[model samples]
Target: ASITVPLESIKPSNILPVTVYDQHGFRILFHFARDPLPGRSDVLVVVVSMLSTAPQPIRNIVFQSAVPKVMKVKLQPPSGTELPAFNPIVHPSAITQVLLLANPQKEKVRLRYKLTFTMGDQTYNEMGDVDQFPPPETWGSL
Candidate 1:
């Protein structure tokens, strides 16, 4: 006999907060929202770009997970670029977010990332959970 766990049985905890900061100490806050589907769960990614020419090295990224396991971090840059390495650490049951540090010197940079939860022998892709923000109509207007 096999036991089946309903999707609702895997409800995630509170949405984790994401913040980005530049080398100069400038900070941008990330707004996270969640959507509960009939048979699926989704997360919306919203980013508010900061106005600065200085190169902001991705000092750290953070998130929380409901269950502690090996999760895959997938990053989709606006352009073609190599993904950073993954550093795993002891995560608490309530929150599990990772921190990434990188140097971006471009005037305008946009990056997308997603986290896939992995269990014993199964993996769940959460890219669909992400919601992208549309580009601004005019640079000055933004």
Candidate 2:
């Protein structure tokens, strides 16, 4: 089944908000707000992190649905490697937003399939999925 996601409803403050449809499957909107800098002079740095539920001692197997997932982000500079320019820090909070340096040249940029979740001891890793899409296009539309 196809899904249509509204732009405004996907804001950062509304992460994982569920939307149900009568005839088709459900859609989840995970919103992430951009972390603003303390002062106006500060350069924006893009950072990506995650928070996951603690693994059960009984080896609880989490059943992740089989579906194609993607992440879209709007950036300032239209070009250059944003992911490599910033460092990421992990925390216990469910919300994780990294400060990315603003690229004034490009008004907006979208990164599709930029992250993947995996279980590693106490935390998860944000591994880039190469198979998701081709090169620069992987950073944006299909």
Candidate 3:
């Protein structure tokens, strides 16, 4: 384990209300929290969560992201690899993941994301990018 940010460090107050993707059945969102390490201001903690509402078995879920060379990103292990079939009355939790972004130069955060999972008898892949990061100034003030 290189370095893992505590889950407690992220809170509902840290969530960023930005537009995310809704591909097939996956709805992804991001949150922002302060990095607890020293010089934390230069880094931003991004919490990613994937939600689905399809009434089918989902498995082998995976997520990956990429950033420009001037910046760096790290992904912590996901909450789980399998998602139970959707049921409004039974299960209604989303799969969660954590990503830490280091922006030494105080640059804008943009990320390309890849998501893959098996639902029913078909496996699907979806890729997209996000540019709606909260302003860099807001990051330091948090």
Candidate 4:
């Protein structure tokens, strides 16, 4: 079995916050985490969550997050069945967390992503994945 990112084992401090929202005209807004994840080749983790901004059910939903070109994409659901692909419905007040599992990167590289979220009559396409810790230059001197 390949390594899976233990969401529970991750301290709250390691998690980064990203904006998620939706409106009547706009179906959804997903932002990948800004914090970097730490792991080895045999063990690694990544997270993607969803929030519904509407007051009604966001129906017929499925999300497929693309893997980078460098690494062979291997996104596995939890230890069980595929809920993200299995469920095609998102309720008005539902917040969903999708965890992607694969081997850690051996190269010093970055990841890019493409997402397909089929929600009701609308389809959402986004570009990104959870990010690594921003370089020191971005946040200024430590």
Candidate 5:
């Protein structure tokens, strides 16, 4: 994956648009990040942030995922980076991105994220896989 949709005509919010509506009807935005401008594709950044206001009642949240068996993982922004699910403090409008690097020959990288959210006295969980198109170039370098 050559990574990046270019920032000349579009903003980061539109690169890979996706969102999730939990049980309470509030939305959590995914892929809500922008890669740096040209010549700065140092890493593929994944940003996960909140998009609604429920009085900041999000008690607990954690993002769980696996590193592609063939790709090497790096810790940059999102801390506690591991397939092991742990609690994280994520508030409204807060963003978290997972940085990853794979062999230059791997045309695409895929992974899944499990988001568990607890608000007030309710708990909601959502899980899904993420994949990119055939971007035959190196996504970026670590």
Candidate 6:
């Protein structure tokens, strides 16, 4: 089942593309957006969008993220457990999840993610890291 995501809250200008993975004709891409709360300087809201293009539907999705030991991160649930097969004339949408990151020391925010999804009879696990953010000011730290 597909869950309703807060995609509307994310403006196009706030989106920053992250790393992407390609396996044969299947591709999974990651992008992030910032939605900082008012009066908060140490914690910022992050939205990660996972887009997939494949010939068949993918399922059993599992995703996780990590921050530095000194920092903190909280991941909300994703939009769906299965991704519908992509079709140019049909569905071409991505799943999104909300994450909260805290940088108590004001260090650069970095993240390591592990993604697992099923394609056909095979289950694939991929690990990657995002070493960048939109900008320092976007973090809402003073």
Candidate number achieving the greatest TM-score relative to the actual structure: 3
Better of 4 and 6 by TM-score: 6
Q: Can you rank all candidates by TM-score, best first?
A: 3, 6, 5, 4, 2, 1
TM-score of 1: 0.24
**Local accuracy of candidate 6 as per-residue lDDT tens digits, 1-142:** 1222255665444455655556734454555544433555566566666666877888887778899998888877887778777788976777777767767677787788888888899888889887766554665432
True-structure RMSD, every candidate: 18.8, 15.5, 1.9, 7.5, 8.4, 4.4
Model 6, CA-based lDDT: 0.67
Comparison by TM-score, 2 against 4, better one: 4
Give the winner by lDDT: 3 or 4.
3
- lDDT by residue (tens digit), candidate 1, 26-111: 32334332322232122222322222222222222322222112222222232211122222352211122222112122122244
Q: lDDT, candidate 2, residue 63?
A: 15
- Give the top-scoring candidate (lDDT): 3
lDDT of 5 by residue, 1-142 (tens): 4443332333353455556434453454545333454554434545544444555356556656655676654434442222221225753244354444443445466767677767656777788766652242433321
Any runs in candidate 4 off by more than 4 Å, and if so which?
Answer: 5-7, 20-44, 78-92, 101-142
- lDDT of model 6 at position 124: 88
Residue 141, model 6, lDDT:
32
Pairwise TM-score winner, candidates 2 and 3 = 3
lDDT per residue (tens digit) for residues 1-142 in model 4 = 3644344544333335544334342232332232234423222334445544543334444445444565444454523211232223743333344343333444432445554555456666666544453332222111
* Candidate with better TM-score, 1 vs 4: 4
Show the colliding residue pairs in model 3: none
**Which clashing pairs does model 5 show?**
46-97
Give candidate 4's TM-score: 0.47
How high a TM-score does candidate 6 get?
0.78
> In every candidate, how many clashes are there?
9, 13, 0, 2, 1, 0
Would you give me the overall lDDT of model 5? 0.48
Q: Over 4 Å off in model 2, which ranges?
A: 1-49, 54-97, 112-126, 129-142
> Which portions of model 6 show Cα errors greater than 4 Å?
1-15, 24-30, 135-137
Best-first order by lDDT? 3, 6, 5, 4, 1, 2
Q: After superposition, how far is residue 20 of candidate 5 from its true place, in Å?
A: 5.9
Determine which window of 10 residues in candidate 5 has minimal summed lDDT: 78-87
